[PDB]
């Protein structure tokens, strides 16, 4: 089953944007489809995304990747991005292809969006797509309120007021991270850990203890907000935020394979 290229329109009027997607059909329609949900500033050609697709291909199961608005091959401005808009895109991509069974594979911000997506699907009457499992890699639920807000100083707070965004130096590039006022305000609209989260499926979290961006304690906090059954947390002592060494990729591929078989 070959990779196919698609464009999906999301939103209305001046909010409309075209989302680029790469899709591989399952060898038989009854088999699940793995859907990649990436990190803030990622793109769908990244190492972990390509590995998810390769594993899916080898087992004859489906694979969906797409670029968030403002990222990679998709339309829309980065500074117009919010958790609400990026979630809306994820749901639109799923509703375009309508796989019978989905396994959500969410990395960092993509883990937050995965948790919101299951809530949106469970709220619907007509759901052609059942989520059969979720694999979360250094997930970052509620990062705006829980990881950013407590560290903000008066520099950042005034920047947010005067300019509509603040900047922080990025370990991973010469272009610094920017975080908009709109993202911070809307992150509270999408807060998932202020109460208990109902998934209805197995969840496996993979988290490094040498992660300087999402502290491993954040993964322990997420487990306290998940159901009392069918949740596994794998803590890797020397793992960093990217979790993309060969040994890390082996653990992630094995976690996804256990959701299929
Ligand atoms: Cl990656």
TrEMBL record:
Its EC number is 3.1.1.93, 3.1.2.22. Pfam families: Abhydrolase_6. Gene3D superfamilies: alpha/beta hydrolase. Residues 55-247 form the AB hydrolase-1 domain. InterPro entries: AB_hydrolase_1 (IPR000073), AB_hydrolase_fold (IPR029058), ABHD10_acyl-thioesterase (IPR052382). Keywords: Hydrolase, Transit peptide. GO terms for molecular function: mycophenolic acid acyl-glucuronide esterase activity; palmitoyl-(protein) hydrolase activity. It comes from the Bacteria. It catalyses: S-hexadecanoyl-L-cysteinyl-[protein] + H2O = L-cysteinyl-[protein] + hexadecanoate + H(+); mycophenolic acid O-acyl-beta-D-glucuronide + H2O = mycophenolate + D-glucuronate + H(+). It is an enzyme of class 3 (hydrolase). The keyword Nucleus does not apply. Acts as an acyl-protein thioesterase that hydrolyzes fatty acids from acylated residues in proteins. Regulates the mitochondrial S-depalmitoylation of the nucleophilic active site residue of peroxiredoxin-5/PRDX5, a key antioxidant protein, therefore modulating mitochondrial antioxidant ability. Also catalyzes the deglucuronidation of mycophenolic acid acyl-glucuronide, an active metabolite of the immunosuppressant drug mycophenolate. This is Palmitoyl-protein thioesterase ABHD10, mitochondrial. It comes from Allorhizobium ampelinum (strain ATCC BAA-846 / DSM 112012 / S4) (Agrobacterium vitis (strain S4)). The lineage of its organism: Bacteria, Pseudomonadati, Pseudomonadota, Alphaproteobacteria, Hyphomicrobiales.
């Amino acid at each position: 089953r070959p990779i196919e290229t698609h464009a999906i329109t999301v939103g209305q009027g001046s909010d409309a944007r075209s989302i680029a997607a790469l899709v591989r059909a399952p060898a038989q329609d009854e088999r699940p489809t793995c859907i990649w949900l990436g990190g803030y500033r990622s793109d769908m050609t990244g190492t972990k995304a390509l590995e998810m697709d390769d594993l899916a291909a080898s087992l004859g199961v489906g694979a969906i990747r797409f670029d968030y608005s403002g990222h990679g091959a998709s339309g829309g401005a980065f500074r117009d991005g919010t958790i609400s808009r990026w979630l809306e895109e994820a749901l639109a991509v799923l509703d375009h292809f309508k796989p019978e069974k989905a396994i959500l594979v969410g990395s960092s911000m993509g883990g937050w969006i995965a948790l919101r997506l299951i809530q949106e699907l469970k709220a619907r009457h007509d759901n052609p797509t059942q989520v059969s499992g979720m694999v979360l890699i250094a997930p970052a639920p509620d990062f705006t309120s829980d990881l950013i807000e407590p560290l903000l100083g008066d520099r950042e707070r005034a920047e947010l007021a005067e300019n509509g965004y603040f900047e922080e130096v990025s370990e991973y590039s010469p272009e610094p991270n920017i975080f908009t006022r709109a993202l911070m305000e809307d992150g509270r609209a999408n807060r998932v850990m202020a109460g208990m989260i109902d998934t209805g499926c197995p969840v496996h979290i993979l988290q490094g203890m040498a992660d300087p961006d999402v502290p491993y304690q954040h993964a322990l906090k997420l487990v306290e907000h998940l159901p009392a059954d069918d949740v596994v947390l794998t803590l890797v002592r020397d793992g960093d935020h990217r979790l993309s060494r060969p040994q890390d990729i082996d653990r992630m591929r094995n976690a996804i394979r256990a959701m299929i078989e």
